[PDB]
Nucleic acid binder design. Structure first.
Lengths: 98, 99
DNA sequence: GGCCCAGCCAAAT
DNA sequence: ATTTGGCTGGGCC
């Protein structure tokens, strides 16, 4: 998948660490800030600067937002797909448009 | 019931001029710095800080995002518009209903 | 009423 | 003709 491969490539660069990174477990990823992501990082990896079109694409590939009851950030967004993991770089094509 | 009046009230505040305000013609409103808007202004007036929800409510009330085309307020600006929602029509807010 | 996720068309490919 | 971006809507809670 084109989008998925690019999502994983994004999460390789540590310069982004404080803004968008893998979670501690490595089984989900966290968008910690929004503005610098939306303005600086989204454009460089995807064809938009619109956080919500990013979100929309995630739901199309069956990623789900993980709901907090605070753990990562006040206004952080965490997304998780069962197959999308830091250690499973091989299994990316298994993630596909619902 | 409450949304439209509060939205109108929000736009009565000039201190927010750089962030969110009425459009030149007073017939639509524009969010210019949605980070600042989202994190400072939204909670004040609607008690959440998620732009997506603000957008969702807007569509529920039949507001529409006004797609700009080359020739606005910045490309990261979001302009929203309802025929009956206007700077000079504080009297008409009841006719803006959940579609 | 906030919010996740999806419908549906257009804008790109 | 097919894919990707984005405005809008459905429905849980």
């Amino acid at each position: 998948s084109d989008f998925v491969r690019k999502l994983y490539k994004m999460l390789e660069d540590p310069s982004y660490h404080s803004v968008v990174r893998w979670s501690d477990d490595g089984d989900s990823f966290v968008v910690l800030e929004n503005e610098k992501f939306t303005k600086t990082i989204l454009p460089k990896h995807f064809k938009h600067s619109n956080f919500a079109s990013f979100v929309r694409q995630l739901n199309k590939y069956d990623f789900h937002k993980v709901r907090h009851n605070s753990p990562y950030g006040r206004d952080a967004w965490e997304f998780k797909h069962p197959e999308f993991r830091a250690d499973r770089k091989d299994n990316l094509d298994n993630i596909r448009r619902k």
